[PDB]
Amino acid sequence: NSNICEVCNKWGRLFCCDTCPRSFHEHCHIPSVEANKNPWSCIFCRIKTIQERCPESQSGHQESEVLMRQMLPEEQLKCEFLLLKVYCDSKSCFFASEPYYNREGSQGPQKPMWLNKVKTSLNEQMYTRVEGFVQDMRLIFHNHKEFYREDKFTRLGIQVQDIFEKNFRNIFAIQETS
Ligand SMILES: [Zn+2]
Ligand SMILES: [Zn+2]
Ligand SMILES: [Zn+2]
Numbered sequence: 347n348s349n350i351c352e353v354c355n356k357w358g359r360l361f362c363c364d365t366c367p368r369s370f371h372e373h374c375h376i377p378s379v380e381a382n383k384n385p386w387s388c389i390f391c392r393i394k395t396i397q398e399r400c401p402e403s404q405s406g407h408q409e410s411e412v413l414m415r416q417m418l419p420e421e422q423l424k425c426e427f428l429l430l431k432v433y434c435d436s437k438s439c440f441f442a443s444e445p446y447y448n449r450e451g452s453q454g455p456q457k458p459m460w461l462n463k464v465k466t467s468l469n470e471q472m473y474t475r476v477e478g479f480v481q482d483m484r485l486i487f488h489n490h491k492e493f494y495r496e497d498k499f500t501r502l503g504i505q506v507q508d509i510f511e512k513n514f515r516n517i518f519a520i521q522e523t524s
Contacts (some may be wrong), residue, residue, distance in 0.1 A: 352370055352390075353374035355376055361379040362386075376427075376429055376433070389423070393517070396420060396423070407519050432483075432510050432513070437505055438506060439489075440502050441490070442461045442462055453493075459486045464482050482485065
């Protein structure tokens with residue numbers, strides 16, 4: 347096994363995957379690492395099994411069809427993984443916790459959103475369809491773009507959104523386009 351957490355790249359109290367070399371802090375893994383379960387398999391491994399069980403799940407899909415899917419267990423899992431892939435970039439620190447807004451010349455967003463709120467929402471099964479989760483994720487970056495305006499800090503939102511969007515297309519096997 348690895349000696350650092352796969353998500354935040356730090357040592358500490360790590361739980362080790364039994365089917366791959368990855369390790370995790372308790373609250374870095376999504377869902378939070380399960381109390382018992384020996385052996386234990388991480389979210390990377392559980393996502394690989396889904397693909398291996400239904401190879402055709404990797405044929406191309408339309409985004410509009412993906413978004414309307416109900417949050418059954420396998421879609422729940424894929425959204426948790428996509429969220430985890432965003433937390434794996436260090437720039438996610440800017441979007442993790444509840445923001446506040448007091449900048450000369452700007453007004454705060456009507457609907458604030460942050461990664462830990464989306465985490466809790468997933469955890470509490472508040473999304474009924476994929477669309478619910480993707481809308482909140484995209485709103486995080488859209489709020490940041492609007493508030494920071496021409497400050498070069500807006501770029502952090504573009505960068506972390508690109509990580510989200512690349513992973514969304516991968517995880518949900520979105521049809522490749524020019
Ligand atoms: Zn960690
Ligand atoms: Zn694993
Ligand atoms: Zn099959």
